[model samples]
Target: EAGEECDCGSPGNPCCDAATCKLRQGAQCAEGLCCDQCRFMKEGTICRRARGDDLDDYCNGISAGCPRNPFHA
Candidate 1:
């Protein structure tokens, strides 16, 4: 536990690269470039990919996904 290869598929978490098992990088994009900030939620922050957006779109925002609000259960 603690910093282990967890499921990055969840909100606030990047899509698990599975290859590297690290916080998926290059996932956040914006304005046709790689972004860092996508959005924030009760659970955590999400990136572009998680927003269902291409890895090379516009980051002119945050909190871009639905059902991503957070796990309150």
Candidate 2:
């Protein structure tokens, strides 16, 4: 619970926010600047599902250029 919640300032941004209640209280969680959960959209790509799950995949997908909003980017 020490590091959860997406760094983004919005909700529905993937696991942007803690899925559990522990970090909600106050856990300074952040990869900072919307890493992957809410990528910077590539326009028309449409993000539907994130890539694999290994070492911050949710945030890295966007960082590696995997179309924000996989189903509606």
Candidate 3:
């Protein structure tokens, strides 16, 4: 019920006005530009599954560079 929506902006290439939803009641764009989640694409990579439970294994896919849909608190 708290900290749900977050801004998905990235420097010069900031996210769209809508950004991403990390908190409730539009609490994403509170701190301007920040990111919590990320999605970087690299060589021989198609895409990656969404993150859950804050785990790390690189099972579904390999680690990439910068994220495309970076989220924040």
List the global CA lDDT of all models: 0.31, 0.30, 0.25
1 versus 2: better lDDT goes to: 1
Choose 2 or 3, whichever is better by lDDT: 2
Best-to-worst lDDT order = 1, 2, 3
The digit string of per-residue lDDT tens for model 3 on 1-73 reads 0122223222211122354423223211221222223332232222212223331111112232223443321
C-alpha RMSD by candidate, in order: 12.1, 10.2, 12.0
Per lDDT, the best of the predicted structures is 1
Q: Model 1 scores what on Cα lDDT?
A: 0.31
Per-prediction count of colliding residue pairs? 8, 15, 13
Give candidate 3 misplaced runs (Cα > 4 Å): 1-46, 54-73
Q: Candidate 1's residue-wise lDDT over 1-73, tens digit each? A: 1122233443334334344424335333221222224323323333233323323122233443433333222
Write one digit per residue (lDDT tens) for candidate 2, span 24-71: 322121332232333343333222232234222122234323433323
TM-score top scorer: 1
| Of 1 and 3, the candidate ranking higher by lDDT | 1
Q: CA lDDT of 9 in candidate 2?
A: 25
Worst 10 residues of 2 by lDDT: 24-33
Mark the regions of model 2 whose C-alpha exceeds 4 Å error after superposition: 1-15, 20-43, 53-73
